[model samples]
Target: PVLNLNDPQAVERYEEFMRQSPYGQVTQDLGWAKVKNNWEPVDVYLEDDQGAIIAAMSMLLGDTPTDKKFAYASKGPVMDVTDVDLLDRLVDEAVKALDGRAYVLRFDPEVAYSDEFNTTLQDHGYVTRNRNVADAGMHATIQPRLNMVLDLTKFPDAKTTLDLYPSKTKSKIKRPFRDGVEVHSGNSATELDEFFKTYTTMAERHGITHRPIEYFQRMQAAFDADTMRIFVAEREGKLLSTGIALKYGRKIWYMYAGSMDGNTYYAPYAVQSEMIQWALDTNTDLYDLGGIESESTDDSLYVFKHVFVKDAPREYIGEIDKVLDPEVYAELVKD
Candidate 1:
């Protein structure tokens, strides 16, 4: 009845189960402990009476600026949401599992933002934040509350998804082909250097900061060819756009993109099409374009992202926190 990982051997089996189940996200993989190596991992899961892995979660243990203990579950606890009893039992066990170790446990799952979902969370004394996150310009939550998700099932072909977009968007998507922008995909992690080069150049042009190249190198080391790719868009052999695409569970996420300045062609658009084509080739269910500001339609970047998924943004339930130690919670969170 009292255990941290209930059954250590079940991690792999549950991961496989989670991948095949509905609402599976790659970040829930226990391998993130190696990828996000700084944070210690305290993974836990729930098993059925019949010796079956029914639910799973990976909690990355970290500390606040003041070094207060906390654990965060990112897009985790993959299970049948319809089974409310399992939902309650899963959190209950996690709360107990993390009791003495972590002062608080926070989880942000792929579940949608709904009052009904909030009802159960509130009843369990979990503090949920969505309206507050959106109100503060979406800066409060660790993960973006809103993101663009393209259901890959809708697009049966390598080119089927782009057809739903307006004529302008489709034209932009094809511009690379018309303008002779060719895209190439490779399985080499060595390509990280080139991808980072273009990425840094893009970052410098936009006057923004970028992660170190070695960070991505480690990511490549953790995730293999079946789940990772390096794509580049070229015009007359000059790099126009470059990015890292990843497939895990049932979705392909375009993790990061770097585009050169003064682009005459639609290399950026064309590059995306090729990435999605990879998703189609692999038979994934979704194409995740990452997060976005909830009310940033006026921005050009937001406009471009909107073209792919349109107005319906996936509004995930924001951070749901359970304060295990009230004094430490007050000291660390100050709310």
Candidate 2:
């Protein structure tokens, strides 16, 4: 078994493996291919006999390789998380792949456990960063801590899951749909323009930076048709809220959302409610609500997402460091 880093052919094989593997996410695909308006990713892979790659990890590079002290792997080199030998090879090759110049490789592997996998990770020299169990997910620079998941196998009847949420959450999911908030779905270029405008507004208001409009357009072009649906909510002929939902495998991800100026009055809750119903009817098995920060005291997002599913599996964030330049690394962290 060998782990290859930044080898073009290896990445291709790893990606194909992931498409058929049970655990795969957009980060793995987009990050590996280095797509998007921003973020250049370096990919690493593990291969088996006959040189067929079996595992992979994606690394987001620093703006300046020498000055940048950190590297993050989002939803990461997901493989059989319990393979100790594989994990060891991946770590060693990962460091060398980066020319031995990273302060730490941080990430949260989206792996759920039944005790066995957890034990394997420990055996492979990974130390726990925080509490191992929680009703809420963990968040780190590398991995999503709070993942909002929904089971999509039940079909249209699964729409009733909304009733499972707290009243406050229920309100957030229903208001948008009730106030004549028009929702649109299509892959036309016009749809891409509308999605980016709304997405940018929401991200800026929330203190998060998003990929430029071009990135959204590319994704729209790449995953068009019924596989990806871009939904927008409008009122009085003005756009109020928008979100792009994707359907892959047996799951649907209500991944991106944005709202117009009058979002609150129309009731933002309704926007989410409508989207969730669509996923249920389409028969998706897990809606990833993304992650929640540990410092979020309000818990509104957590409470709201819970309206759909009471039980959730948490993903963890951990880091492995190799001080390529100790003095440089210290300065970077200090600042």
Candidate 3:
């Protein structure tokens, strides 16, 4: 049954499954919905005869300029995709609940790619997204299908964690400490203000988009300090780099980060070192360095992340969609 988002019990049950499941993703967290004000969030799930939730999804619905609503389940439906019966029932419940409201439903589950899974989705009337180019569906995927994740469990201690880096990278981690660089983590409004200033400068310099300060503030408010942290790297009491890290389930995610230009010291490495230590102290399973544009052996970004993970970056099966309203989808995609 699809639980109404307003019900207290429903919210509790939804978050419980999200936090406990190994498949838990911050994007699928209920708190994330509050951060995306443009969308109306909903929780849908299927329960067994004993009333235990076996499957669930945190769905976000946004209205387009053309008055049609589009739905997205980021890294979700927190279920066993191999269970065809569960997938069918969940889809049926979601479709019925969103019947007149959503024009399409898009999802990018965390399940590894498989021909059987693709066939199952096809059999259930869904389609895989195009990798090379955009299609006549909704907008291109919002989440990257590729990521760089470090298996934290391999490092049983701080020394092993430091050893994961090369001699040069490892040197940089220590260089900042000797150069009067200090790293700190917090959830204060002041910290957000300071972080956004450097973040804005970095974004503009790189010609990238950065969210407003309130977005980060909303996130900090939604998730407690235990779950989210803002790390700031400073030298001589002047901020040089800042990063936001999230601890969820067994993973520590280096979510958003940027560094100031013309810093004399390697403050960014110091910030990363602090977060890595936090992950170790908490005994998390993985430290996700976030997404990358490419998996190429020669990509500079891939090389940088590889120094820490010591493993090849993992690729994901790209976005897939369940087209609910073909005519509206066609109209939106029309040139």
Best by TM-score: 3
RMSD of each: 2.8, 5.0, 2.7
**Can you write out model 1's per-residue Cα lDDT over 1-335, one digit (the tens) per residue?**
22334467555576677667676767777666668888877766677789676787777888666546688888876775435677667777777767677888888887788888878878867778777546443247788878888887775654554665778788778777898989888767556766887899989998999988767877777778777798888888787778788888778988888877785387777878887787777788888887887547675656777767765878887888877878887766532
Candidate 3 structure quality by residue, lDDT tens digits, 1-335:
77777788878987898889887888889999989977888668888789888888788998887667988888887887668677778877888878778778888876665667777777878777635434323455566666788887665655445756778777767888889999888888877877898899899889999998889988988999989999998887888988899998778999888778786387777888888888888878889887766766777667666656667676665666778888887776432
What's the TM-score of every candidate structure? 0.89, 0.73, 0.90
Candidate 2 lDDT tens digits, 70-164: 66666666676556687678766677777755666655566654455555566565543334434332323344455667655534444564654
Model 1, residue 142: displacement in angstroms?
Answer: 0.7
Where model 1 places Cα greater than 4 Å from the true spot, the runs are 1-11, 135-139, 155-161
Q: Over all chains combined, what TM-score does candidate 1 have? A: 0.89
How would you order the candidates by lDDT, starting with the best?
3, 1, 2
User: Which has the better lDDT: candidate 2, or candidate 3?
Assistant: 3
lDDT of 3: 0.79
| lDDT, candidates in the order shown | 0.75, 0.61, 0.79
Candidate number with the higher TM-score (2 or 3): 3
The alpha-carbon lDDT assigned to residue 249 of candidate 2 equals: 46
